[PDB]
Amino acid sequence: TVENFNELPAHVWPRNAVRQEDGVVTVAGVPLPDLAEEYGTPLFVVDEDDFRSRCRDMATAFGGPGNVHYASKAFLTKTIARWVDEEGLALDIASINELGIALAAGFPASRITAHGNNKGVEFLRALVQNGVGHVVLDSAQELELLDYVAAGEGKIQDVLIRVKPGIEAHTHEFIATSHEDQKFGFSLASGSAFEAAKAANNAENLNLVGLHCHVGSQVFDAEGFKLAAERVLGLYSQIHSELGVALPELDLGGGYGIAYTAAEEPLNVAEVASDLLTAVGKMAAELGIDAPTVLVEPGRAIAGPSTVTIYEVGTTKDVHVDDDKTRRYIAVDGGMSDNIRPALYGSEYDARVVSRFAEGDPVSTRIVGSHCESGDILINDEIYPSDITSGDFLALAATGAYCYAMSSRYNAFTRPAVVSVRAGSSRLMLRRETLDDILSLE
Amino acid sequence: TVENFNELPAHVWPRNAVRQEDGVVTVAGVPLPDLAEEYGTPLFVVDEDDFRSRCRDMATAFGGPGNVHYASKAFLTKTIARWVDEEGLALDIASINELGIALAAGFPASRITAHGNNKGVEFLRALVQNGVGHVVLDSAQELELLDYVAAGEGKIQDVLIRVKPGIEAHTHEFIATSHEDQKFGFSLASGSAFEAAKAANNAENLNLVGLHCHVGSQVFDAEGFKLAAERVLGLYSQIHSELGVALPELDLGGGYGIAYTAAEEPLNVAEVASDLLTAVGKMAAELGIDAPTVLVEPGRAIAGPSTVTIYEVGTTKDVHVKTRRYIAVDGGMSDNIRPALYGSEYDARVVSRFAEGDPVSTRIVGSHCESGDILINDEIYPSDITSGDFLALAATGAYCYAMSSRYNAFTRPAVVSVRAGSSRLMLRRETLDDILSLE
Ligand SMILES: *Cc1c(COP(=O)(O)O)cnc(C)c1O
Ligand SMILES: *Cc1c(COP(=O)(O)O)cnc(C)c1O
Ligand SMILES: N[C@@H](CCCC[NH3+])C(=O)O
Ligand SMILES: N[C@@H](CCCC[NH3+])C(=O)O
């Protein structure tokens, strides 16, 4: 219905977003159309307080901000790093450039954890030389090369080892296997993970402080995380009984969900965490080991909901799909260059007109970008009012995770601007790219 | 076999690529490993003469360079625009920034054709002010807005109209329908396209010179293009009989294929063009209309084969699934999204030596922290490929760099060209400072 389209699902949209009585959407009191006019479109708008409130939710649920690592892969800038730093969270990075951005912002290295399946010697030296607190080891070669690097610096590097527990956790199910056919870490089932823990134990310049797993995506309950934790704690028990070694930490990774569409439920992090951490304590007590400090690495569930992408609506057309059915195509000014996720993953977003209330009869609609490719589709098939037209401002919710980070210059499109909002004012976070930026590489 | 892996399939690889006796692959005389050492990895290497020779192939087949439009969307830099200019080709752009690149390179605007499904007023004004030769109209709104813009400038803008003929041409089939459920252009089956042609003709500041269609991807024969052309020429006949209007040009778009893997055959442009062009002339005679000048818009088939992407091999690991051997390289889905996005299959080779190991099921992955960052999904390659080897993927000259991202803050790779035993930097590698500059 037209009424349903003119709603604003509060569990999807940023926490400080409101539908005003004239149809305008504000975020932190700032009207979205005014941002679109000031900064241009497409535009990412970041509800700063939303982001910080997620940090806090997580910190309370997991027994302190230092147990929560923000997964920078979702979205990292100097501003984001500072927000994380101020909130007391740890920061996970996965490349030399994510480390660069974090160090540029003055994020303390002792609070950084480093990931990556193919860390080279330059990265590893940078990590050791800047005193990064943890490195998560992904392979035997890395374990040997980091031990080398660390010896060269006269340092002992605290490490976790990434293990594959054979659990893939999703929204409605988890999938359990003995073996995981993917590039990361060491197999639990085969003995490889234990052999890596022995290698880290034998190493003169590494200090093993726990194991890590990352098993989830769009997860809203603890059942898969629990089974992963039980499987990995089985290895803790073998490490204790066979090596005499106690591990103080257990990093159970990320994958906490957010609601992308109105029909989905938001995450109840308090409930999930309570379930998970109660289970981990019970499991530890059963095996006769110290209950480890549980670390988590949410990306999506810290950054996603805060951010929306505003577009200007452009061309509209009715397209007959057969003799009897019509699909209404609405073009927006960006496309798969600022949100590749519909095309790549089949991701479904919530779209709203943020500049007015719509009044037209609802009709089957497809929202497309401005790229010269037929798969540049943002919203594949929804029923939206037929009056959405050129000059309307149309926004997609929950674009603060992965969307900007995966942005391209396809068709020489420029990366959009990113602005934060708080207390009725806006601040530029990242400037829009220009033609000159594109040409600068020549 | 090991012997098969140590080959270099000439019909996939750039035309001036050669496997030397020590296993090292050179392109235009320049050893790929030297380039990797000099410019770092990942590295795009463009065989300049390959690119030019494709242009020349296309120009001969379609009756002169001016009838062949390079589809900039495949890859555009000022250097590429200069090559196209020099080869006598037309240039197709699809955004104000593709226009900007072309104009910064001094590419003649009269030789530019502008595409896009959602052209804004600023782009349209730029096209008209700079004197771009053709605009391809995509919607009723664009037709009315361009006529207004062109009036504002005191110019008459030559246009084509994009039509949907209900044909999708692929490698092993074509698909025919009465309607195409996509965003571009005007339907032929409803009469919408006819009404657009009438409106453009009637417009005081638009000059209708033809219709356009783009129907293909990875096409190696003319059968789909022919039926598209017949369906569009039927509309030409209706325009002649119902409006009295003759159309001198017919733009049949792109979609010409390249061979990505060894098993695939290369495109025979001369044969496909001869088949299509002969058929167009025959259809025009049968309908009693002027045979139009046929325009084509290859992207992939001009730029793709010229270019390889060189990686440095890093981490190797055996993973029990039977065992799959995982080889990591230093780039990934940030420099080639096509395997993840489309399922695209590439040819990988070690370019720094001959391999000697027994062949095993292998997967080549990138360095990003996502399990889907896979570049080669399932191939049987020698088990001795190892850290420090240079491993290249062929035919990366179309779409790969244009679709590149800074995921995990990875920097865009450098692009170098090679010719006559020398290398020239085309695009420098991005740096951390480039990323930080937006702050
Ligand atoms: C992806 C990832 C996380 C977070 O994923 P989200 O779904 O965004 O929470 C944490 N740790 C690692 C190693 C990852 O790869
Ligand atoms: C994609 C495209 C071409 C060329 O596609 P290729 O497969 O690279 O040849 C030409 N014209 C238009 C409008 C296109 O969208
Ligand atoms: N990179 C895509 C898009 C180009 C074709 C459509 N313009 C491909 O693999 O074909
Ligand atoms: N689905 C996310 C990636 C999650 C990363 C998991 N290791 C995306 O858009 O890339």
Tab-separated table of C-alpha atoms in Angstrom, chain A residues 72-74 76-80 94-98 100-101 104 115-119 138-142 162 164 179-186 190 312-317 319-324 327 329 331-333 336 340 343-345 366 368-374 376-377 389-390 402 404-415 428-435 437-442, chain B residues 72-74 76-79 94-98 100-101 104 115-119 138-142 162 164 177-187 190 312-317 319-321 324 326 328-331 333 337 340-342 363 365-371 373-374 386-387 399 401-412 425-432 434-439:
chain	number	residue	atom	x	y	z
A	72	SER	CA	37.213	-2.408	9.764
A	73	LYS	CA	36.396	-4.305	6.541
A	74	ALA	CA	32.861	-3.097	6.842
A	76	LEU	CA	37.033	2.363	7.764
A	77	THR	CA	38.056	6.024	7.726
A	78	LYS	CA	40.089	8.095	10.224
A	79	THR	CA	36.773	9.327	11.608
A	80	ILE	CA	35.469	5.844	12.115
A	94	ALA	CA	43.063	-6.916	7.531
A	95	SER	CA	45.575	-5.098	5.327
A	96	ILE	CA	48.495	-2.770	5.517
A	97	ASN	CA	46.321	0.066	4.393
A	98	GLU	CA	43.569	-0.524	6.945
A	100	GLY	CA	47.608	2.789	7.844
A	101	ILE	CA	44.270	4.480	8.204
A	104	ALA	CA	46.865	7.942	10.733
A	115	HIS	CA	43.851	-10.564	10.101
A	116	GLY	CA	44.626	-11.785	6.616
A	117	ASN	CA	45.027	-14.993	4.692
A	118	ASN	CA	48.129	-13.814	2.792
A	119	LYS	CA	50.070	-11.380	4.955
A	138	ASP	CA	46.090	-17.976	9.063
A	139	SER	CA	48.768	-20.404	7.805
A	140	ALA	CA	51.892	-22.339	8.622
A	141	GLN	CA	53.953	-20.063	6.374
A	142	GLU	CA	52.674	-16.997	8.195
A	162	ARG	CA	42.347	-19.061	13.080
A	164	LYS	CA	37.816	-23.838	11.006
A	179	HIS	CA	35.819	-30.028	6.727
A	180	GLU	CA	35.389	-26.417	5.430
A	181	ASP	CA	36.387	-25.864	1.791
A	182	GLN	CA	37.712	-22.308	2.159
A	183	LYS	CA	41.048	-20.525	2.261
A	184	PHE	CA	41.215	-19.388	5.877
A	185	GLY	CA	42.879	-20.911	8.882
A	186	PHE	CA	43.581	-24.415	9.997
A	190	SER	CA	42.256	-33.058	10.891
A	312	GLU	CA	18.185	11.621	-6.885
A	313	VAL	CA	15.506	9.934	-8.976
A	314	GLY	CA	15.915	10.412	-12.696
A	315	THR	CA	14.353	8.633	-15.661
A	316	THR	CA	11.164	6.676	-15.239
A	317	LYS	CA	9.599	4.294	-17.689
A	319	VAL	CA	8.272	-1.636	-19.536
A	320	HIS	CA	5.954	-4.432	-20.673
A	321	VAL	CA	7.424	-7.751	-19.505
A	322	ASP	CA	4.854	-9.815	-21.474
A	323	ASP	CA	1.585	-8.754	-23.228
A	324	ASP	CA	-0.180	-8.251	-19.821
A	327	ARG	CA	7.293	-3.219	-14.630
A	329	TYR	CA	11.753	1.184	-14.041
A	331	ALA	CA	16.675	5.159	-12.521
A	332	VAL	CA	18.816	6.727	-9.848
A	333	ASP	CA	22.060	8.545	-10.230
A	336	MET	CA	26.358	-0.858	-8.743
A	340	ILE	CA	27.437	-3.728	-5.663
A	343	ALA	CA	24.193	-7.552	-8.025
A	344	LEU	CA	26.904	-9.549	-6.235
A	345	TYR	CA	25.042	-11.270	-3.392
A	366	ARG	CA	12.536	-1.958	-10.279
A	368	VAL	CA	18.157	0.697	-11.493
A	369	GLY	CA	21.377	2.649	-11.645
A	370	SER	CA	22.891	4.891	-14.346
A	371	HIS	CA	25.507	2.344	-15.648
A	372	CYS	CA	25.501	0.958	-19.128
A	373	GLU	CA	24.914	-2.634	-18.017
A	374	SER	CA	21.441	-4.331	-17.614
A	376	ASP	CA	22.959	-2.551	-12.592
A	377	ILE	CA	19.914	-3.070	-10.485
A	389	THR	CA	9.489	10.694	-10.227
A	390	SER	CA	12.478	12.731	-11.460
A	402	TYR	CA	30.462	-3.040	2.795
A	404	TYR	CA	31.295	2.165	0.244
A	405	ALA	CA	34.174	-0.190	0.770
A	406	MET	CA	33.311	-2.122	-2.373
A	407	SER	CA	32.659	0.975	-4.493
A	408	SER	CA	34.135	1.232	-7.990
A	409	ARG	CA	34.785	3.799	-10.701
A	410	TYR	CA	32.863	1.831	-13.296
A	411	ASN	CA	32.017	4.099	-16.203
A	412	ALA	CA	34.439	6.581	-14.488
A	413	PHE	CA	31.779	7.316	-11.834
A	414	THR	CA	33.230	9.125	-8.849
A	415	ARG	CA	32.994	7.681	-5.283
A	428	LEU	CA	31.934	15.914	5.872
A	429	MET	CA	33.737	12.643	6.496
A	430	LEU	CA	34.941	11.777	2.974
A	431	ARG	CA	34.752	14.127	0.043
A	432	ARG	CA	33.282	13.082	-3.201
A	433	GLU	CA	35.810	12.057	-5.837
A	434	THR	CA	36.249	14.275	-8.880
A	435	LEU	CA	37.308	13.845	-12.517
A	437	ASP	CA	41.097	12.307	-9.027
A	438	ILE	CA	40.456	9.891	-11.875
A	439	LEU	CA	42.808	11.697	-14.148
A	440	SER	CA	45.459	12.008	-11.405
A	441	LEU	CA	46.549	8.442	-12.083
A	442	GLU	CA	47.695	9.348	-15.525
B	72	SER	CA	34.965	2.961	-23.523
B	73	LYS	CA	33.152	1.120	-20.700
B	74	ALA	CA	35.582	-1.773	-21.236
B	76	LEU	CA	39.314	4.085	-20.786
B	77	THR	CA	42.328	6.272	-20.084
B	78	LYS	CA	43.753	9.217	-22.035
B	79	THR	CA	46.278	6.848	-23.549
B	94	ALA	CA	28.552	6.598	-21.321
B	95	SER	CA	29.144	9.241	-18.660
B	96	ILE	CA	30.270	12.769	-18.224
B	97	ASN	CA	33.582	11.530	-16.837
B	98	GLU	CA	34.181	9.181	-19.773
B	100	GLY	CA	36.064	14.175	-19.723
B	101	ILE	CA	38.758	11.594	-20.144
B	104	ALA	CA	41.398	15.672	-21.928
B	115	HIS	CA	25.220	6.517	-24.391
B	116	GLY	CA	23.349	6.320	-21.091
B	117	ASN	CA	20.027	5.318	-19.608
B	118	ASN	CA	19.799	8.299	-17.211
B	119	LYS	CA	21.575	11.257	-18.767
B	138	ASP	CA	17.308	6.080	-24.249
B	139	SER	CA	13.923	7.559	-23.092
B	140	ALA	CA	11.189	9.958	-23.885
B	141	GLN	CA	12.362	12.272	-21.142
B	142	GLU	CA	15.904	12.377	-22.604
B	162	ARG	CA	18.085	2.770	-28.774
B	164	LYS	CA	14.941	-3.340	-27.920
B	177	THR	CA	11.361	-12.614	-27.132
B	178	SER	CA	8.520	-10.151	-27.915
B	179	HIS	CA	9.514	-7.930	-24.924
B	180	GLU	CA	12.844	-7.240	-23.160
B	181	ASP	CA	12.551	-6.658	-19.420
B	182	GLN	CA	15.477	-4.224	-19.039
B	183	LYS	CA	15.972	-0.545	-18.493
B	184	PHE	CA	17.365	0.561	-21.872
B	185	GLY	CA	15.693	2.159	-24.814
B	186	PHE	CA	12.332	1.739	-26.410
B	187	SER	CA	10.285	-1.362	-27.231
B	190	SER	CA	4.651	-1.891	-28.759
B	312	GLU	CA	52.883	-12.631	-7.009
B	313	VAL	CA	52.045	-16.039	-5.542
B	314	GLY	CA	51.957	-16.065	-1.785
B	315	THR	CA	50.443	-18.576	0.670
B	316	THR	CA	49.837	-22.140	-0.382
B	317	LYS	CA	47.838	-24.682	1.527
B	319	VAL	CA	42.593	-28.134	2.216
B	320	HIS	CA	40.643	-31.363	2.718
B	321	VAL	CA	37.214	-31.137	1.107
B	324	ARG	CA	41.971	-28.852	-2.934
B	326	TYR	CA	44.636	-23.192	-2.303
B	328	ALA	CA	46.800	-17.073	-2.680
B	329	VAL	CA	47.828	-14.139	-4.816
B	330	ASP	CA	48.307	-10.536	-3.778
B	331	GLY	CA	45.236	-9.048	-5.402
B	333	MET	CA	38.262	-9.385	-6.238
B	337	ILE	CA	35.507	-8.892	-9.663
B	340	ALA	CA	32.787	-13.561	-8.249
B	341	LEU	CA	30.209	-11.395	-10.004
B	342	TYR	CA	29.571	-13.280	-13.249
B	363	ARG	CA	41.811	-22.951	-6.431
B	365	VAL	CA	42.216	-17.003	-4.208
B	366	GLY	CA	42.986	-13.426	-3.424
B	367	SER	CA	44.106	-11.676	-0.269
B	368	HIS	CA	40.736	-10.234	0.907
B	369	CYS	CA	39.050	-11.309	4.041
B	370	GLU	CA	36.016	-12.876	2.382
B	371	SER	CA	35.811	-16.561	1.373
B	373	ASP	CA	37.412	-13.757	-3.096
B	374	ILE	CA	38.236	-16.473	-5.585
B	386	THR	CA	54.703	-21.562	-4.830
B	387	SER	CA	55.437	-18.340	-3.015
B	399	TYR	CA	36.047	-4.567	-17.457
B	401	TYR	CA	40.325	-2.505	-14.015
B	402	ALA	CA	37.169	-0.432	-14.645
B	403	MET	CA	35.348	-2.506	-12.010
B	404	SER	CA	38.221	-2.352	-9.467
B	405	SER	CA	37.554	-1.461	-5.838
B	406	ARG	CA	39.438	-0.425	-2.717
B	407	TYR	CA	37.931	-3.233	-0.651
B	408	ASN	CA	40.098	-3.741	2.463
B	409	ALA	CA	41.665	-0.418	1.386
B	410	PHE	CA	43.568	-2.191	-1.377
B	411	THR	CA	45.179	0.241	-3.810
B	412	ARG	CA	44.298	0.122	-7.506
B	425	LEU	CA	53.525	3.484	-17.323
B	426	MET	CA	49.935	4.173	-18.263
B	427	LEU	CA	48.254	4.542	-14.845
B	428	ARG	CA	50.302	4.674	-11.685
B	429	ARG	CA	49.447	2.431	-8.725
B	430	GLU	CA	47.334	4.066	-6.080
B	431	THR	CA	48.880	4.720	-2.674
B	432	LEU	CA	47.645	5.037	0.930
B	434	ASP	CA	45.290	8.548	-2.328
B	435	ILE	CA	42.938	6.837	0.086
B	436	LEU	CA	43.683	9.231	2.847
B	437	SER	CA	43.279	12.239	0.451
B	438	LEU	CA	39.502	11.901	0.636
B	439	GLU	CA	39.584	12.548	4.316
